[PDB]
Scaffold this active site. Structure first.
Site, PDB file in Angstrom:
ATOM      1  N   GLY A  16       0.843  -1.205   0.000  1.00  0.00           N
ATOM      2  CA  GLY A  16       0.000   0.000   0.000  1.00  0.00           C
ATOM      3  C   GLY A  16       0.867   1.239   0.000  1.00  0.00           C
ATOM      4  O   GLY A  16       2.103   1.116  -0.130  1.00  0.00           O
ATOM      5  N   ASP A 133      -8.045   5.128  13.801  1.00  0.00           N
ATOM      6  CA  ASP A 133      -8.220   4.587  12.432  1.00  0.00           C
ATOM      7  C   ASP A 133      -8.772   3.157  12.510  1.00  0.00           C
ATOM      8  O   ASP A 133      -8.312   2.266  11.832  1.00  0.00           O
ATOM      9  CB  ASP A 133      -6.929   4.715  11.615  1.00  0.00           C
TER      10      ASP A 133
END
Ligand SMILES: COc1cc(-c2cncc(-c3ccc(C4CCN(C)CC4)cc3)c2C)cc(OC)c1OC
Ligand SMILES: COc1cc(-c2cncc(-c3ccc(C4CCN(C)CC4)cc3)c2C)cc(OC)c1OC
Ligand SMILES: COc1cc(-c2cncc(-c3ccc(C4CCN(C)CC4)cc3)c2C)cc(OC)c1OC
Length: 284
Positions: A16, A133
């Protein structure tokens, strides 16, 4: 004495903008190795600062092993080493797996347990911690059917921004009370409610199950903008759909009520992680 530091990197299991995660091997044992991009160095520093402050140890928190910084010719290489969970993330797991009542409750109560452990200040102990998160990609599935919470790169302690699809209304409309630690706990509870929706959809009742979808799949694009999210969550005040079939099943009826008490516009109306645990222990 000999200090064995060699880790064999065997298989990339994630790539990512954050960098990469690898299955690795140390002294015959699987470990997970997160290699940070230059873009995300501050997440390595924050998680390392937190673990230097308090060595968290909980069955529903991804187990810390090491933080490593290595000098290279023209760069610094940052690795976070943790326990390895071969079943992968909850996001991954829910794509093809369906759940029964017992497995669904065990997943969500384990997440609530890890989250309450982060949130609660212990005296003598640990500071209170908000995650900032929480989402199904940041939860790992264990072989025993419980989950654990991962990624404390955005965590805040009390004694990069969050993923936009999971942002609470007060984050999107910039009204969050940034000087108040309870504000951050209430942003995690909103995100928890979205995760509870994602999992409940995959629980079978009367031969019916929903396909895996991410929260707000029907009202925002992929990689939704900050404005896309604000219009849905803040202006129109939309919330994820509760299917009719849930109201034939006592477990999903109770979970629908729970998720609705994580999604109040008023942050101070939302349930606490401890109250969510108690409610889940009384279901079934
Ligand atoms: C430096 O780097 C890494 C080190 C290791 C590692 C390998 N063998 C042994 C050790 C060890 C642990 C603890 C003690 C104690 C013994 C009791 N005494 C009173 C204080 C000291 C000594 C030695 C370590 C920490 C693994 C790593 O990766 C998995 C490392 O890289 C991140
Ligand atoms: C980092 O991670 C791993 C580390 C090790 C490891 C290797 N050498 C030595 C140790 C050690 C020995 C003894 C103490 C002392 C502390 C003070 N007092 C005197 C009692 C006990 C501490 C540490 C460890 C813990 C093994 C691991 O797995 C088997 C690790 O996990 C990947
Ligand atoms: C969320 O964040 C972090 C996660 C991890 C982590 C820990 N255990 C296992 C994993 C994993 C293993 C395997 C698969 C796949 C491969 C095989 N199969 C085809 C499907 C499953 C996916 C995932 C990860 C990614 C480590 C981290 O740091 C070291 C993380 O960052 C904090």
């Amino acid at each position: 004495r000999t200090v064995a530091r060699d880790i064999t990197l065997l298989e990339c299991v994630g790539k990512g903008r954050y960098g990469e995660v690898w299955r690795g091997s140390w002294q015959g044992e699987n470990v997970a190795v997160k290699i940070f991009s230059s873009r995300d160095e501050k997440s390595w520093f924050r998680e390392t600062e937190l673990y230097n402050t308090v060595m968290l140890r909980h069955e529903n928190i991804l187990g810390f092993i090491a933080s490593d910084m290595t000098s290279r010719h023209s760069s610094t290489q940052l690795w976070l080493i943790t326990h390895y969970h071969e079943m992968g993330s909850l996001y991954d797991y829910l794509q093809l797996t369906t759940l029964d009542t017992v497995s669904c409750l065990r997943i969500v109560l384990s997440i609530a347990s890890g989250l309450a452990h982060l949130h609660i200040e212990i005296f003598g102990g640990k500071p209170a911690i908000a995650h900032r998160d929480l989402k199904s990609k940041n939860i790992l599935v264990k072989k025993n059917g419980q989950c654990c919470i991962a990624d404390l790169g955005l965590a805040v302690m009390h004694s990069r921004v969050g993923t936009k699809r999971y942002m609470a209304p007060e984050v999107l409309d910039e009204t969050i009370q940034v000087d108040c630690f309870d504000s951050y706990k209430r942003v995690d509870i909103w995100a928890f409610g979205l995760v509870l929706w994602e999992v409940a959809r995959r629980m079978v009742s009367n031969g019916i199950v929903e396909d895996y979808k991410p929260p707000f799949y029907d009202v925002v694009p992929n990689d939704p903008s900050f404005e896309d999210m604000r219009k849905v969550v803040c202006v129109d005040q939309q919330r994820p759909n509760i299917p009719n079939r849930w109201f034939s099943d006592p477990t999903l009826t109770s979970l629908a009520k729970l998720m609705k008490e994580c999604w109040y516009q008023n942050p101070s109306a939302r349930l606490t992680a401890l109250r969510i645990k108690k409610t889940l222990t009384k279901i079934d």
